From Swiss-Prot:
Protein's UniProt name: Small ribosomal subunit protein uS11
Protein family: Belongs to the universal ribosomal protein uS11 family.
GO biological process, one term: translation
NCBIfam families: PRK05309.1, uS11_bact
Keyword Lipid biosynthesis appears in the UniProt entry: no
This protein's UniProt keywords: Ribonucleoprotein, Ribosomal protein, RNA-binding, rRNA-binding
Taxonomic lineage: Bacteria, Pseudomonadati, Bacteroidota, Bacteroidia, Bacteroidales
Biological role stated in the UniProt entry: Located on the platform of the 30S subunit, it bridges several disparate RNA helices of the 16S rRNA. Forms part of the Shine-Dalgarno cleft in the 70S ribosome.
Organism from which the protein derives: Porphyromonas gingivalis (strain ATCC 33277 / DSM 20709 / CIP 103683 / JCM 12257 / NCTC 11834 / 2561)
Length: 117
RNA sequence: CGGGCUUGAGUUCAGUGGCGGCAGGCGGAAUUCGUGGUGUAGCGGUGAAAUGCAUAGAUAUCACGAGGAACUCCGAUGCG
């Protein structure tokens, strides 16, 4: 039981190891999602623009045939491929409205986990 | 030993300044846990992997709730 009428929000959660693209309606209810690991890029190449393009194309094709036409992009986390995903969901029928970087930064919060040697 | 002086020293008055100390209040970002909604094939991690968590419903996303800790930019100087 979902209902996405005309416009929605795309969420990209990237990191140094993987990228997850998830499209949702105005109430943040996900209708489709994809990732490099889902596409089958289990390697160091999970953080590749090609993998991001493949995942974004799959997600956009899966979600376009549901009434989704316009989307607003939110991006969290670093990593190559966010631009590729944005371009792919822009060119796969879905029209982008704005690009918003919601990457969370701390105002000196909790302690980071040590340092690798 | 006795007397004198104002430069040392101290007291007063004024100006200016500070992450200087102790104590009480208040705040936002982030993180963790629980509850509910959407959704399903993976997430996480490495030089590469596995252990680990997941169809008895994870990662992701939205809302409600709870608690602890530290204070981005200013910001390299200043105080003791």
């Amino acid at each position: 039981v979902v209902r996405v009428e005309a416009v929605g929000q795309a969420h990209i959660h990237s990191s140094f190891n993987n990228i997850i693209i998830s499209l949702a309606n105005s109430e943040g209810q996900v209708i489709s999602w994809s990732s490099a690991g889902k596409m089958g890029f289990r390697s160091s190449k999970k953080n590749t623009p090609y993998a991001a393009q493949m995942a974004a194309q799959d997600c956009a094709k899966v979600a376009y045939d549901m009434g989704l036409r316009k989307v607003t992009v939110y991006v969290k986390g670093p990593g190559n491929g966010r631009e590729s995903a944005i371009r792919t969901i822009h060119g796969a029928g879905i029209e982008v409205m704005e690009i918003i970087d919601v990457t969370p930064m701390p105002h000196n919060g909790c302690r980071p986990p040590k340092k690798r040697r």
